[PDB]
Amino acid sequence: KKVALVTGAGQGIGKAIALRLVKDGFAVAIADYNDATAKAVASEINQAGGHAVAVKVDVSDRDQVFAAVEQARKTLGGFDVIVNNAGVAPSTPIESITPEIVDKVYNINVKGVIWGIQAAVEAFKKEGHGGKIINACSQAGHVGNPELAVYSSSKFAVRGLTQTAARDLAPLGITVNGYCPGIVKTPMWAEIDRQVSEAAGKPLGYGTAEFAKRITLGRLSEPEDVAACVSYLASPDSDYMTGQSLLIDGGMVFN
Amino acid sequence: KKVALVTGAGQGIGKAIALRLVKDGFAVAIADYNDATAKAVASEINQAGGHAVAVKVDVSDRDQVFAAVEQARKTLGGFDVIVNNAGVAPSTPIESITPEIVDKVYNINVKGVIWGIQAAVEAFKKEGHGGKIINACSQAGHVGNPELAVYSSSKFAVRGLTQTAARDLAPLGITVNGYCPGIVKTPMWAEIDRQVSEAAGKPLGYGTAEFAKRITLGRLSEPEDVAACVSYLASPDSDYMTGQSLLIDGGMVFN
Amino acid sequence: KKVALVTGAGQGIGKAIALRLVKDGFAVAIADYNDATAKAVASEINQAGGHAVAVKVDVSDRDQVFAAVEQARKTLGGFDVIVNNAGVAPSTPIESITPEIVDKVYNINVKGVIWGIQAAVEAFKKEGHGGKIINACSQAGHVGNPELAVYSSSKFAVRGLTQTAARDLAPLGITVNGYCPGIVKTPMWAEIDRQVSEAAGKPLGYGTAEFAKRITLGRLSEPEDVAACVSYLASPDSDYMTGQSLLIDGGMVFN
Amino acid sequence: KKVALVTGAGQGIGKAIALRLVKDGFAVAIADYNDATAKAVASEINQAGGHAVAVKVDVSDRDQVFAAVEQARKTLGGFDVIVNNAGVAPSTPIESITPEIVDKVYNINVKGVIWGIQAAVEAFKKEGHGGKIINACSQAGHVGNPELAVYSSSKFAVRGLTQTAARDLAPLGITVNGYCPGIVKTPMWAEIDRQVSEAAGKPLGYGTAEFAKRITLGRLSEPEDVAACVSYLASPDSDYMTGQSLLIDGGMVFN
Ligand SMILES: NC(=O)c1ccc[n+]([C@@H]2O[C@H](COP(=O)([O-])OP(=O)(O)OC[C@H]3O[C@@H](n4cnc5c(N)ncnc54)[C@H](O)[C@@H]3O)[C@@H](O)[C@H]2O)c1
Ligand SMILES: NC(=O)c1ccc[n+]([C@@H]2O[C@H](COP(=O)([O-])OP(=O)(O)OC[C@H]3O[C@@H](n4cnc5c(N)ncnc54)[C@H](O)[C@@H]3O)[C@@H](O)[C@H]2O)c1
Ligand SMILES: NC(=O)c1ccc[n+]([C@@H]2O[C@H](COP(=O)([O-])OP(=O)(O)OC[C@H]3O[C@@H](n4cnc5c(N)ncnc54)[C@H](O)[C@@H]3O)[C@@H](O)[C@H]2O)c1
Ligand SMILES: NC(=O)c1ccc[n+]([C@@H]2O[C@H](COP(=O)([O-])OP(=O)(O)OC[C@H]3O[C@@H](n4cnc5c(N)ncnc54)[C@H](O)[C@@H]3O)[C@@H](O)[C@H]2O)c1
Ligand SMILES: OC[C@H]1O[C@H](O)[C@H](O)[C@@H](O)[C@@H]1O
Ligand SMILES: OC[C@H]1O[C@H](O)[C@H](O)[C@@H](O)[C@@H]1O
Ligand SMILES: OC[C@H]1O[C@H](O)[C@H](O)[C@@H](O)[C@@H]1O
Ligand SMILES: OC[C@H]1O[C@H](O)[C@H](O)[C@@H](O)[C@@H]1O
Numbered sequence A, B, C, D: 001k002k003v004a005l006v007t008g009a010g011q012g013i014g015k016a017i018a019l020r021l022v023k024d025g026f027a028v029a030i031a032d033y034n035d036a037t038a039k040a041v042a043s044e045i046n047q048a049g050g051h052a053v054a055v056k057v058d059v060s061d062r063d064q065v066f067a068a069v070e071q072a073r074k075t076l077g078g079f080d081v082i083v084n085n086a087g088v089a090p091s092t093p094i095e096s097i098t099p100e101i102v103d104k105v106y107n108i109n110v111k112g113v114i115w116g117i118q119a120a121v122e123a124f125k126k127e128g129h130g131g132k133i134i135n136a137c138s139q140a141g142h143v144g145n146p147e148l149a150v151y152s153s154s155k156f157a158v159r160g161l162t163q164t165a166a167r168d169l170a171p172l173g174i175t176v177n178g179y180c181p182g183i184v185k186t187p188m189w190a191e192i193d194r195q196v197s198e199a200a201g202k203p204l205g206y207g208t209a210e211f212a213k214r215i216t217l218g219r220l221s222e223p224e225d226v227a228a229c230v231s232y233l234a235s236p237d238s239d240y241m242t243g244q245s246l247l248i249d250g251g252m253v254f255n
């Protein structure tokens, strides 16, 4: 069956995506910086009858990404979809932004996506066909969010890469799209809430409260809500879609 | 089974959407101004082993839309999705636009969508649950297309309606989204090409050639390509998406 | 020597635009269907040393718009800029939208803009040069606003017209742009607030307070803020800008 | 008189902006990594009757940007506007992108803007008032351009920073906007065309001609066209505008 590699699949949205893709019929490579959670997710999948393999990789490292993609391609017998999902999101008061903070966020969120794109392109060529590249964006990648200058800008960058890649890779039978979540219940958001709440000298949940006011559907997102959109982007039903970054955010930003 | 009503389902994109929804498991109401084609499509669906009913309706007439929706709800045993697909697309040289031309296009493309939204809202309420409203937009509803002032503006209006409706109806558990095709092989585009070519003093095909140049995927769209996107919008996989007008245009416009 | 015609110039934003354009050096035609206010504004301008003429016109009527533009062109001795500013904005709960309401709003907001574009195109042609067409849009023309389905969709339509016109008329040396205000202190907003507040059973000001929450700059808009943006759109400094609908809304929507 | 600092003002768009701001009445700090051109431009301004000072700075370095702003603030007697204009734009075939290429482009284009924002914020606070931050974006910052993955994404990031900054800094009476040029006749574009043409094995001018096909106005941009837009963004007429990245690209992208 078809093969997909999902980065940051050890937990949160990445894990949800991996599980959904397995349900969709994909054999999946669980790629993550965290060896323990990657193996835990791969095990959960295999225990339920699916086909998964854990792959340790730091997406900020170009050679590691290529190695991860090739390992998955050889082991799973193919390569049809890559989901560049791994990412970090520290809240960043503008006056306190440092070169170190920018490097950390961009090396993972932006370079990681570029490396994933390149490795997938070569993998598709070696398999002798086209493919689907799916990147993790955010509604903050469409509209700069408050207190998230570095993160928001990194996601805008991902959307830019998504669009240029869609145009440049089209002749190779490759499409490039992205998914844009809103406020999702994962350790990532919990941390943003903590930083923003603490910085405002307010109780935990304050950040969630402020951002949740802009969610039209009136509830935070489940990782599965995002995975459901990614399922479409990994399916042939999205074959005629490219360069798009879909908002699966409960209606925070409208396009 | 879940129930959906598709306007303009007698042919083209509308018919393709209806057939795809049937494959997805929906009982479908084939709504069209053309009674003969609606009945033919419904018959085809029923003879094939699916469930459908044909309803004659001019979407520009509010009472006829409510009647069509209610007939579908009673006959099919429920109402879960409405696809306001019917539309017209005459090319309109700016200096030649008349109020008659504006009325013709807007009465179907804009008013028809408003009536569909209202009728669906009442059907959902009578059923005691939420629902999905899906509107036919166009890439021309995101970026004004040359020689298509009236058509483009009508689709921008449809997207505006889609967004306000998404915000106003969210409390009722109703989502409102749209699909934006590119250049689809149906009699609608055939006519635009003929009009644009003649006005330009160029042989037939000038329109297709000019617009086709912006399609990143380098191929024209099949009605089924659009139906594949609508399938997602009709599925529970789109539950957390609202107020979006997805581009399933082969990459003509990037969002 | 430059000439501009501003529709809906009898009060609010239109009047502010007219006065600013006069300060910028334009001879201005005060177009409005309100004879009293149009003549009062023209009088105010002429008494201060400026050059203006009042012109009676219901922008929903194509012939009247052409006649108004031609009267301005002949009386003021030229025609360089048209500002299609006149508009109406009733709040419209979705369930109660009627064909009459849609017609009232669209005949003024949408058709009025089309007639203005056409009339200006002919005027520029008769003057032997190009020109600037400026349309009144709204942040609600970029993102559908709650309780404003008909109004929002009409402004989305205006933006669509702005874009197609920009592309279609470029060869004639004509640019077409729009301005998008936020919450401006004029009788129009006061009425929206009254309608929304009444519908909700809230004291006057409820609507203003709710919509104001999204204004980044934390203050309501003055008609002069909008006039300052239009000044740019009417000046040669905007010569290389076309097809754009600028947000001069205090930061409600971001592009 | 008001004070403005323009990075990359030694040539191209930056020089044009500086000269226009001088005409508008500003005292300007010519900041550039090229000491020769910076002093040459400052010299031309002072000899012609204006007030300017050359400041050497590599915008990729945070400390240097702060030092440049402070030198400008002390020497020119104030600080009211900053134009983070400096930038680089290499064409980058996706398969050939290296971490080195990304760092070079992002350290200048993205970090440079962050440092400028921070330095400006502190300068404004020290001057005891608000201010205007203006960043150089590009139409490629709204839509990913072919063969320009790294450059396009860096400009998307700039827009992201522009938006978050506008929201975060609003309380300080600071607005943050950007300008988006199209194809401008400067050494930067000349180099992009050379790279793209050589890569395609086609004569010089190939890239220029291909990209120019998307310019609605049908003519290449002059640095002064961009400076004209920045003039508006530096003037009080843009006081009620924030978080916007205006397209002064001849109509390549429409918002
Ligand atoms: N949580 C949200 O609300 C939200 C909203 C929008 C977008 N997103 C995006 O969705 C993606 C998933 O976020 P999430 O909530 O699941 O985050 P998370 O923090 O819960 O999970 C991130 C995963 O990434 C892995 N990872 C981190 N750095 C890595 C690196 N250098 N190399 C490899 N793996 C690495 C982690 O081990 C972890 O399992 C991210 O790109 C995020 O920006 C999240
Ligand atoms: N064809 C394209 O390239 C393209 C691209 C973008 C968007 N769209 C949109 O997709 C939708 C379907 O277009 P299509 O190509 O299938 O068109 P089509 O002309 O092939 O089919 C339109 C259907 O609408 C029905 N219809 C027309 N007026 C009606 C009315 N007043 N009431 C009820 N039914 C009515 C017709 O009988 C017909 O079956 C439209 O909304 C169109 O704007 C089409
Ligand atoms: N007020 C706001 O908050 C706001 C925000 C965004 C956009 N706008 C837009 O700005 C424009 C000006 O709005 P405003 O607040 O000044 O409105 P307003 O109601 O205060 O003034 C409108 C003017 O239009 C004239 N007018 C109305 N219908 C007309 C017709 N058919 N023919 C000719 N003249 C006609 C009126 O006589 C009046 O002088 C409108 O297009 C409006 O949609 C206003
Ligand atoms: N030229 C175009 O067609 C075009 C289109 C869109 C956007 N832009 C943007 O406009 C801005 C100006 O571009 P341009 O055409 O004038 O470029 P240019 O290459 O002609 O001029 C750039 C200036 O930046 C200075 N500079 C470069 N790196 C620097 C650094 N690290 N620190 C300080 N100064 C540095 C250079 O010395 C030079 O004077 C850039 O941000 C560019 O991305 C240009
Ligand atoms: O940077 C280039 C990458 O792809 C190349 O094809 C090599 O096979 C791989 O080892 C390398 O990491
Ligand atoms: O009044 C608008 C519509 O809704 C009403 O409730 C009626 O049920 C329907 O016949 C009518 O067309
Ligand atoms: O018909 C549209 C308008 O333009 C025509 O060219 C005529 O000049 C004018 O009388 C008419 O009202
Ligand atoms: O940390 C960035 C800047 O912070 C302060 O402004 C310091 O005065 C300056 O020296 C430094 O470069």
Ligand SMILES: [Mg+2]
Residues within 6 Å of the ligand: A093, A094
């Ligand atoms: Mg803070």
Ligand SMILES: [Mg+2]
Residues within 6 Å of the ligand: D093
């Ligand atoms: Mg190539």
